[PDB]
Amino acid sequence: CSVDIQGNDQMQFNTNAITVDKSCKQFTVNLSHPGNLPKNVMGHNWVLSTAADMQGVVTDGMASGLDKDYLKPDDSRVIAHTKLIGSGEKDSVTFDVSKLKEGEQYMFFCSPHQGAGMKGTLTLK
Numbered sequence: 001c002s003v004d005i006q007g008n009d010q011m012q013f014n015t016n017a018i019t020v021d022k023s024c025k026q027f028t029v030n031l032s033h034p035g036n037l038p039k040n041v042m043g044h045n046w047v048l049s050t051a052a053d054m055q056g057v058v059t060d061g062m063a064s065g066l067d068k069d070y071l072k073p074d075d076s077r078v079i080a081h082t083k084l085i086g087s088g089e090k091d092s093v094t095f096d097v098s099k100l101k102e103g104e105q106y107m108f109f110c111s112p113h114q115g116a117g118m119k120g121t122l123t124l125k
């Protein structure tokens with residue numbers, strides 16, 4: 001009921017498809033950042049939304065800037081997210097699986113680097 005995900009200095013996650021077992025009450029994402037760049041240069045987060053909401057979350061988040069960890073304050077389209085991290089840092093987020101609809105289309109992504117392709121899928125199986 002948890003996953004360890006890495007974001008690197010090349011704006012890649014080390015996975016692009018998360019499966020959430022239906023037996024899980026909660027799900028945990030453990031985000032880390034290999035490499036050698038600070039958070040104000042090459043910062044990463046982990047953000048969950050529906051596929052439909054992703055573009056708008058990313059656009060509004062980018063425009064909110066670093067100080068706001070590239071997320072629009074109190075964004076209702078964000079199901080779950082970590083904080084923004086630099087190299088050698090880590091952060092975890094846990095959410096209620098009850099917030100997911102089984103078999104539906106969810107995307108995960110880093111908000112400042114989604115446009116560079118830092119994204120993948122998540123499915124309640």
Ligand SMILES: [Cu+]
Pocket residue numbers: 007011042043044045110111112113114118
């Ligand atoms: Cu990123």
